[PDB]
Symmetry: C2
């Protein structure tokens, strides 16, 4: 850990907190190719529709992309809360 990765992480989650339907993010990892790629795991309502969840991650990425120029790509895997 370094002050820099910290600021990043902080941002990601800050964007996250912006979605209500989103829960228990974890296994959030970073990669630094040229100048970063974020990958992560979020949980949603078992009863949520796949199509919705699709739409969801798209907005997250969009949002992610908007908030920081340093971010190149974002990958989000989705699970039923509880795992």
């Amino acid at each position: 850990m370094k002050r820099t990765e910290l600021d990043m992480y902080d941002d990601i989650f800050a964007v996250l907190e912006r979605f209500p339907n989103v829960h228990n993010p974890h296994r959030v990892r970073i990669r630094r190719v040229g100048t970063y790629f974020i990958e992560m795991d979020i949980e949603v309502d078992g009863k949520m529709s796949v199509k919705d969840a699709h739409e969801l991650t798209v907005k997250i990425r969009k949002e992610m992309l908007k908030r920081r120029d340093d971010i190149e790509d974002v990958t989000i895997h989705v699970e039923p809360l509880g795992n």
Copy 2:
């Protein structure tokens, strides 16, 4: 391509054909670490429940694992048919 990768690919899909709810697999990729890892993309009913889809991929992996001993791990990403 070589006769060997072909046989593999063939198997994977053969397992796939064993799930009715599963559609349009593509971006199926292999990796050979020691002695392989398969990763892939399948489509399901927008209206499908995330919890179900979870359950689904689990059985696929299980099945995958059963059918070939050479397979170490399996990753499946899910999307609404149509993308």
